[PDB]
Design a protein around this nucleic acid. Sequence first.
RNA 1: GUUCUUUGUAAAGUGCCUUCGAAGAGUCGAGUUGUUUGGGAAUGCAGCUCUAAGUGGGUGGUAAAUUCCAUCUAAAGCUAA
RNA 2: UUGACCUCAAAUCAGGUAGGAGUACCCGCUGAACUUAAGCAUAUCAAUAAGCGGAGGAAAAGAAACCAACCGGGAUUGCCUUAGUAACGGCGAGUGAAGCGGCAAAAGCUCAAAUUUGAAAUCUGGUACCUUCGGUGCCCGAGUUGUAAUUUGGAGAGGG
Lengths: 193, 52, 99, 203, 148
Amino acid sequence: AISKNLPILKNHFRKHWQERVKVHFDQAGKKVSRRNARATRAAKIAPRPLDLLRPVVRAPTVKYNRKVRAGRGFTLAEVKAAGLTAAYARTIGIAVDHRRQNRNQEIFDANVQRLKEYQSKIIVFPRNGKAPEAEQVLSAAATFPIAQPATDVEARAVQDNGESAFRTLRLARSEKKFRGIREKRAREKAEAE
Amino acid sequence: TWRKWNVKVNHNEKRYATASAIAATAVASLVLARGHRVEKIPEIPLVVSTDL
Amino acid sequence: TVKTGIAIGLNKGKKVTSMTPAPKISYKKGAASNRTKFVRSLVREIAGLSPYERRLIDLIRNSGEKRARKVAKKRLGSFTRAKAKVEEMNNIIAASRRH
Amino acid sequence: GAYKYLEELQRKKQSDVLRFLQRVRVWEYRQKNVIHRAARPTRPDKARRLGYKAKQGFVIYRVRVRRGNRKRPVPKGATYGKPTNQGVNELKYQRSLRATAEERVGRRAANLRVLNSYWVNQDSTYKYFEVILVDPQHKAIRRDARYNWICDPVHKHREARGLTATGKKSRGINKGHKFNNTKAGRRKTWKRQNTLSLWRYRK
Amino acid sequence: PSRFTKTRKHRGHVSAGKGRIGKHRKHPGGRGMAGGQHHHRINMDKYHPGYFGKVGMRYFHKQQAHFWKPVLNLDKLWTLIPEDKRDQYLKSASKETAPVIDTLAAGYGKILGKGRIPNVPVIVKARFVSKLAEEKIRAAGGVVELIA
RNA sequence: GUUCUUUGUAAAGUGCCUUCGAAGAGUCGAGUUGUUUGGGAAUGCAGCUCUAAGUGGGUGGUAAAUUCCAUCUAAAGCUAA
RNA sequence: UUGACCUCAAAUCAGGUAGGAGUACCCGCUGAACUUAAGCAUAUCAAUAAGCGGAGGAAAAGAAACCAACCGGGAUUGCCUUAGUAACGGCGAGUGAAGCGGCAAAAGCUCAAAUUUGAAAUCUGGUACCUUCGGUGCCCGAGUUGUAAUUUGGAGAGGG
């Protein structure tokens, strides 16, 4: 059973796995269905852009915090800052997320400017039925793409103030480690006299 | 049914053979040996007008 | 919290212009009303005390509050609910035979 | 509004006024049948916050069930297996007693739909529950679009599939890491992670 | 291709390459990792040292993204700069026009001092740096700006 | 695309100031027992026992006390792809 | 004596509804052993087969008492990945997720908790008529032990 040097394998096939094997033969078949579903939908949702406009959002989790990402909705405070109501915005194609807030000015002003550019690129048709048709653009994300912000510039000047860039890391890590016991030093001697 | 049917091929190697197959449509040494009857034609490659 | 701009330390993180957004109304689920204060006071005057609450008030007056919290922690779930119930029992006897 | 006063009063279950009514009502409910029709809800404020309305088509039933554990049948105590499965007297019946009360009512009144249920009284041997039932064939429920969703046939025997309030609690359907095993269905989640997914171009 | 297998070459031979005394059976020595401490110990030790037992401390609910810190040596430090602009910074080494390299955008967490860099002032923006990685950068006239 | 009916001193949306702002109980939670889970001083569930609070409560993957912070608003319900 | 109210009955009362089949897929209950560990009892097979109850064209889940510790994400589901990883286990055999990230698809909502109190404004049924998946009028009944309207926390209401 164990011989002839080999890495120890962990193959989880001790149950009735053959009864639950799913082979995706319909990968080509379902792809045609999605394109067919997208085509028959767009005719029913005449010339709306087939998707709602979604804001720019910074990811959590520092592995991903350096990137911006398309979010869910335009953050009710942002909708009022753009000059329209939330209930009206949902009928124009502006997705609204009521459960998220704004604690970043750069993200807030980018989303407000995103909404201003959207209202300047739409043709809202009256309820009467005049219909001056405005032949469909199939994507609202390809028209207003998500772009990474420009943090810094290409070239600057060398500013060497003399902090060595590593003692700062060693000191900051040390003062956090010994923060808790040093507040007790200020408490064990404050009670004197 | 879960036998392997489709075979994965590297994209660069897939284009490598396609470029070699276009270069196989060069001088009729390969074309005559491939069974095509191209002895009494002007030249290889044959370039015709766009009106086709 | 003002960030320091470095990846470690106490206030680690990039410096960002804060916005102090509007507080949510769902956060104010603790304080209910003046009317709910009126109703809850009326029901306790009607329903009176419960059998375990009668034992607690007989231990605060006799065996102090330290031993009463031990019984309240055994009766109620956690120790934090015991401290709030004993102080609640304290206000009943402070309004019973003080003045 | 008087419903605020009853709601606060119903939480004083060990007060003298409630425990006297508890002892009187536990006797009255025991003299009647196991399943019997209730003319009006015992707790109007508890019923109306569970979806009950005071009009034609809303029916209240009172049902009692036997308390305790579930004894495995296993005649003469023999299980014929490993010693890990020899327990007979400490099995706990993963469905709640309130769910059993709903299921017994839903078989007697098979023409109705179970909406919700609530605890009314209990003793050593019996736990008493009151179940709210609606009539899907009554025109007051077929109209009044706030309640016509129950008439659409996907809601047939909700309490028999664990779709009620006590049914989803027993199935553990909530959000978060504490319900990773049971948040989209225990058998569907297990089948999802025990399925060997193979594509045309093997990954 | 089954036509290139040794089963086709074993047609006509009785034992099919399994021997007449061995008599190939279902599981002569057990199933899977059976007997790693009883009759496969000579194979477990000698080619798998350390398999049995525990050494470390447990870590409940480990998130691998918490320990995300890709390293970038001082070897390259310039593939992050596009090749078109790389040469015009190398032959024009001077301050007040030092290139700013944000290693975080490239997908790196810590800078390590393995390689040797040309004597060009370079502005580096990184989350973490090694001790002597900073020394080689400062010796070339550059600085490291700590970011988050 | 056309056509017939005016719903209505109706309904709806937005600004400022002022007073309020009701929100689910044998339930949460706790002990114990059984079962279950990768969940490990106890993940979920259920039986029994105890039984809440209102600037409160739950959660923050090691049990406890103390002091903060962050995050949601349970014990009611509907809904396409 | 008479007329109500409450509760509980009766009728081949007026009008309806439930059963059974199918059950590939779905929602639950119940629940093994062969087998593996070269024995075997925990474990494994397996939260599986068999048994039982209940649906649909999908079902279920679903608009956070969530994930997170971040420069914060933002209903549910599925795929790729996380990952054979954290962890569990005679720490043996074996078992084994989840957050982030990319994509498919995208949709949000309302009851309880309020005095309409200058008017129960609500609804079933019967009957008559009509443009009949219903509408109008009239008459009994349901209902104040609360049916409508307004409000659902993202708020909102009383007011000016």
